[PDB]
Amino acid sequence: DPSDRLVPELDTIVPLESTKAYNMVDIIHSVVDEREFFEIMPNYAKNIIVGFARMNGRTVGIVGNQPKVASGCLDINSSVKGARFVRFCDAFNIPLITFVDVPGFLPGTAQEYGGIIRHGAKLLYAFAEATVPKVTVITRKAYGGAYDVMSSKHLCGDTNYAWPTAEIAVMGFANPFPAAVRGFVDDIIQPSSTRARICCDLDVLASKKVQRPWRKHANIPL
Amino acid sequence: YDPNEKTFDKILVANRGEIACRVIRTCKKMGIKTVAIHSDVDASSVHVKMADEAVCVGPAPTSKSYLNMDAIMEAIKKTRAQAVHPGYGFLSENKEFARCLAAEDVVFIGPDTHAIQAMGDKIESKLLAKKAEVNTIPGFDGVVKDAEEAVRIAREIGYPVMIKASAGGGGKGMRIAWDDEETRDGFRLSSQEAASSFGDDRLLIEKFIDNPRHIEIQVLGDKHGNALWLNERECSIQRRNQKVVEEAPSIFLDAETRRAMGEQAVALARAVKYSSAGTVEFLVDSKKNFYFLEMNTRLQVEHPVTECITGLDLVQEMIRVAKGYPLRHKQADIRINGWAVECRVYAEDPYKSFGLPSIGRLSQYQEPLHLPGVRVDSGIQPGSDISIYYDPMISKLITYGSDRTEALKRMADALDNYVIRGVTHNIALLREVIINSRFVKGDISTKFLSDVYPDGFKGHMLTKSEKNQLLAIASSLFVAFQLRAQHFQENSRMPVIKPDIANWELSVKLHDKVHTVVASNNGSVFSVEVDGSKLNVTSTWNLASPLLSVSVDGTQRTVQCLSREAGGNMSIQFLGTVYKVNILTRLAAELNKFMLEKVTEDTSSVLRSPMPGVVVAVSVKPGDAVAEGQEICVIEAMKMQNSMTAGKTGTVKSVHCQAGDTVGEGDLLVELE
Amino acid sequence: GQRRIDAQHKRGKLTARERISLLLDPGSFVESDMFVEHKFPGDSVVTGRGRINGRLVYVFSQDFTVFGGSLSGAHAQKICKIMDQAITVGAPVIGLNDSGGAQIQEGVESLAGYADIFLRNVTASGVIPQISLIMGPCAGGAVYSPALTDFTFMVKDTSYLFITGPDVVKSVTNEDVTQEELGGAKTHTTMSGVAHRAFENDVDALCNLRDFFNYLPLSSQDPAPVRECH
Numbered sequence A: 001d002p003s004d005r006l007v008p009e010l011d012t013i014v015p016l017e018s019t020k021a022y023n024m025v026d027i028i029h030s031v032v033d034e035r036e037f038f039e040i041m042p043n044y045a046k047n048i049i050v051g052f053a054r055m056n057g058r059t060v061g062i063v064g065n066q067p068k069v070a071s072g073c074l075d076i077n078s079s080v081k082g083a084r085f086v087r088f089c090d091a092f093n094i095p096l097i098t099f100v101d102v103p104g105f106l107p108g109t110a111q112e113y114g115g116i117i118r119h120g121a122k123l124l125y126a127f128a129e130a131t132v133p134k135v136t137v138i139t140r141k142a143y144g145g146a147y148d149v150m151s152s153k154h155l156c157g158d159t160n161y162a163w164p165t166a167e168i169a170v171m172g173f174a175n176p177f178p179a180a181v182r183g184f185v186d187d188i189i190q191p192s193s194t195r196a197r198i199c200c201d202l203d204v205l206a207s208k209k210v211q212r213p214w215r216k217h218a219n220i221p222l
Numbered sequence B: 001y002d003p004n005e006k007t008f009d010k011i012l013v014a015n016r017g018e019i020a021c022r023v024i025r026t027c028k029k030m031g032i033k034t035v036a037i038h039s040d041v042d043a044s045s046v047h048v049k050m051a052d053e054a055v056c057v058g059p060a061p062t063s064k065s066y067l068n069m070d071a072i073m074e075a076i077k078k079t080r081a082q083a084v085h086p087g088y089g090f091l092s093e094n095k096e097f098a099r100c101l102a103a104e105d106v107v108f109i110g111p112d113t114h115a116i117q118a119m120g121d122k123i124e125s126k127l128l129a130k131k132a133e134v135n136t137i138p139g140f141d142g143v144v145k146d147a148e149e150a151v152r153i154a155r156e157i158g159y160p161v162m163i164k165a166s167a168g169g170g171g172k173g174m175r176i177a178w179d180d181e182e183t184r185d186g187f188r189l190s191s192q193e194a195a196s197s198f199g200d201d202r203l204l205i206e207k208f209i210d211n212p213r214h215i216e217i218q219v220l221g222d223k224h225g226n227a228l229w230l231n232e233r234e235c236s237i238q239r240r241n242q243k244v245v246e247e248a249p250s251i252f253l254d255a256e257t258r259r260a261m262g263e264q265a266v267a268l269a270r271a272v273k274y275s276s277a278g279t280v281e282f283l284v285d286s287k288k289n290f291y292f293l294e295m296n297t298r299l300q301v302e303h304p305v306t307e308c309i310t311g312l313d314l315v316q317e318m319i320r321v322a323k324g325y326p327l328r329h330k331q332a333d334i335r336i337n338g339w340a341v342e343c344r345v346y347a348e349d350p351y352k353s354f355g356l357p358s359i360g361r362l363s364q365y366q367e368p369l370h371l372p373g374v375r376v377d378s379g380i381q382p383g384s385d386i387s388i389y390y391d392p393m394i395s396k397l398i399t400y401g402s403d404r405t406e407a408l409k410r411m412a413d414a415l416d417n418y419v420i421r422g423v424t425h426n427i428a429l430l431r432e433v434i435i436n437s438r439f440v441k442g443d444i445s446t447k448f449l450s451d452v453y454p455d456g457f458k459g460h461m462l463t464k465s466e467k468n469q470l471l472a473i474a475s476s477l478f479v480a481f482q483l484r485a486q487h488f489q490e491n492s493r494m495p496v497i498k499p500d501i502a503n504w505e506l507s508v509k510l511h512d513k514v515h516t517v518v519a520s521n522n523g524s525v526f527s528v529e530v531d532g533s534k535l536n537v538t539s540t541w542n543l544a545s546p547l548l549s550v551s552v553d554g555t556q557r558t559v560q561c562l563s564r565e566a567g568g569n570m571s572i573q574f575l576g577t578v579y580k581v582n583i584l585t586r587l588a589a590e591l592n593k594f595m596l597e598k599v600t601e602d603t604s605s606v607l608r609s610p611m612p613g614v615v616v617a618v619s620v621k622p623g624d625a626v627a628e629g630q631e632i633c634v635i636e637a638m639k640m641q642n643s644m645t646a647g648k649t650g651t652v653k654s655v656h657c658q659a660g661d662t663v664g665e666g667d668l669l670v671e672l673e
Numbered sequence C: 001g002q003r004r005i006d007a008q009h010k011r012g013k014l015t016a017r018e019r020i021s022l023l024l025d026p027g028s029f030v031e032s033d034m035f036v037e038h039k040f041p042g043d044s045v046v047t048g049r050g051r052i053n054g055r056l057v058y059v060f061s062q063d064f065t066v067f068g069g070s071l072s073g074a075h076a077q078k079i080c081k082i083m084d085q086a087i088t089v090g091a092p093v094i095g096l097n098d099s100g101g102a103q104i105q106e107g108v109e110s111l112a113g114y115a116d117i118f119l120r121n122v123t124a125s126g127v128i129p130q131i132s133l134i135m136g137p138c139a140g141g142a143v144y145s146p147a148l149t150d151f152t153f154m155v156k157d158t159s160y161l162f163i164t165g166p167d168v169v170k171s172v173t174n175e176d177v178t179q180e181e182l183g184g185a186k187t188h189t190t191m192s193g194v195a196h197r198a199f200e201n202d203v204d205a206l207c208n209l210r211d212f213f214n215y216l217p218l219s220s221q222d223p224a225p226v227r228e229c230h
């Protein structure tokens, strides 16, 4: 499987209407080698997708939002499911690839009483401490603090890309231009060139090394 | 293709799909600027991308996008288009469009309003054809109004009877009756659907020909009074009175009969004062006697195939005729220039009623354009979406050659080298048709699918040698994947000790049988032992390419690996049909022998929805006992409607589908006992 | 303004500088970035260092209700700078959270500053102690900084912690809930498990904060503190 293979089928997969939803698993299958994707917890917290795949023969971990289920909103179960997978991938030098399409967090009294703050902080922490190379692609939406949740540029995110249909805003800023001019995304790439860009970024980032203050261990908000 | 010749500068294409792209390609070859219309859904289709400028002509549905005429006139006024080409279907036969275009200065590329007015219905078209000295189906002219008159006409025109709903068309409002009571009941029912569907409320009674051949004559006319006929075509292979396999040079007709066909068609066209391109259809019995049946006053769907035997471009000639220029070809200039066969690839499941339309998105789409003598007329691309609004058509595959055998071989190769992933197509059905013994021999009829496949399409009945080749290829591919899985980069800390297994003993479950396979690997050559048979399989073993070419015992075979699982299940498209195989190791087979069959409730008694689309109405309610052959509901989609029967007796526990609702493919409609 | 200070006092709440003065030792507060503007000096945050019982600490306080419109970029820059100084010298960080008069609409991509603060909290986790005291209403991503800290305390009847406001809850889930029930101190201290302790008012909360800070070491390198025993 060539690393420069194009994916023209991704050019029109994102519907123009924000209400209409799409399948992120299709994008994941298109991007990865041989369209092979080993999903983890496929029937639990379906509004987030985590799994293992290969790019140019190298094992990678993939985390993404699922607009089909709950419109991609993040809740307690999705937060924990993504956080533990990200921690495991970071612990064993496995690069991470993130696909971002999130409107925010699921509201309600049940979510607040269940401790949505703690699990959101879990996901922020898991994405923040990761020292493995990480590549983030924004497909349609990144609203509120949820954009900061899934590997923003300010969490030591190495390379960030946005599709022409992406939109980043504080509240419910209808274009990715503010993020581009502010330097929050490295480039606005065509959807059909995602695979080659990701492969090149992984190739150049394979030798990343960072230094952090010494500690026995940190205090993750478990 | 002379650009010095002066023609229209701007041309508008008021259509969609493959025909829009074909017209745009012709116009680019002729140097004419092109503009195309589209709905909101088709905002990134092939034709809108390849044609300069584009205007949205309405929402998704055709009735408000490609039939919202005021939008078309506004678009023409905005773009100052001198002419419009309707393609086929939609507004290709709307006389109000003709008069509206005549109101302005925009010229309409096609037959004049008088020709379509004459060929708008059946009966007076038959009258004018008979006045033109043209052989026609024997029958009774005039409007049938009562069942008594219908049964009397049945008596004096012969026992086989056929009831036709005039106007409309497209394989609807048509029935065959074999009895006087059948005659009257079919008459009243057909009047009912004519009121429901067409609204004409006027029928026709005709004699039914047994084992007919459907032969088409392509005719061209101009405003200068010149009429020409371009050879013949053969399109007997059809289901639901809809064509699937088309053949330009008829193997059944000889030279003098073909010349008679052309002369009669030219005379009929001159009678109508036809001044455009059209097709006249005929029914030929076993005694080489031809009878008239309809003529389409538009470009036919199977137009390209005759081009492959003539060399001229139909669209270019139509545009030149519309400009005013006369024909530059005479009767003697046109000759047969080889052989050609065309197949219509649809987005339908061939295992249900010889075609079962489905919806979806194209994950992968690759065309065999690099194969010799292959032409593809398609309007889709990787990522195209199939809606519930338009034709379920995918593309047309045309293969031309020196003779029958070479063209059919090229057709089979192209069908083998065609990649469609995302929807279900009828490639297997087309391949079985083109490799059938009768089709190669040439003995076909309009009911070829009905009698060759009585109970419906089942797939390819692979022979012993083909079965052995398939098993060998599957085993070799499985072993190749296993060997590739062992290739790791050097670790320098824990060196990888590659296993040195020599022979792989595998159990392959196919259909319902289990075979033992012994595989040995040597470089790129696999020696495969299947139940005593010995085979050698060699290839590049590229495990990422969708198409895999393998040389098994010298024979070259192209296979596709549609699916693959760690449990051993593999779906392999081989010789058109897709087979599901289960490959395990022999030890794994012995251990799996103890695995239970589980509590999987294979008791049926549940009916699902093979139709994605909109259900018109539901004939059952919660608490009804269904019966064999009783249809549950009618679902409209893909410009047609059909109802599915339960096939068993059972009380309805609950009803989940209501009239006017939308039900997707595979959804549970009604639960029965 | 004086009117804003009076309005804050009318609710039983103190100003940010008053809270800092109560928390720290008398005559030990040293402020930083005094002349950083957004046009007002201070940018709705007071950041500096001080001593509690002779032990160094770094503090920041928020006065959005009486000063400033919403989170600008310089607010996050000041917080990040004070956290960087604390991680450089190895001293605990104490943060008094009060986002009352902060406009969610007037956010010029403040999510970037939120992300920077989150990154610094994650980096400092396990290196220096971090304490958060929520003294006023908080909403949006700002609720995630206290969650990433080691300990979280709230003030009864005057503090809130919630992702989205009650109006959004009514609009989406169609349920009538007040602010106290949705994000009150009792909710987060009895059934949510987010906060650790709740105090009667600001003065009592600050006194208990000093008492609790006396327990902790200054850094993970230092051993557990040892005091005089009787």
Ligand SMILES: Nc1ncnc2c1ncn2[C@@H]1O[C@H](COP(=O)(O)OP(=O)(O)OP(=O)(O)O)[C@@H](O)[C@H]1O
Pocket: B137, B162, B168, B169, B170, B171, B172, B206, B207, B208, B209, B212, B214, B238, B241, B281, B283, B293, B294, B296, B446
């Ligand atoms: N008189 C006939 N005798 C026998 N079979 C017939 C007769 N008329 C039609 N058929 C059968 O019905 C099929 C379709 O016939 P016909 O072209 O009249 O239908 P239609 O729906 O009007 O077609 P179209 O889509 O071209 O408008 C033929 O291919 C043939 O199989």
Ligand SMILES: *C(=O)CCCC[C@@H]1SC[C@@H]2NC(=O)N[C@@H]21
Pocket: B062, B088, B089, B090, B170, B301, B389, B390, B391, B639
């Ligand atoms: C809507 O999808 C209609 C498709 C185009 C018309 C189809 S295809 C060609 C046949 N000729 C005709 O008039 N209707 C049929």
Ligand SMILES: [Mg+2]
Pocket: B281, B294
């Ligand atoms: Mg016909």
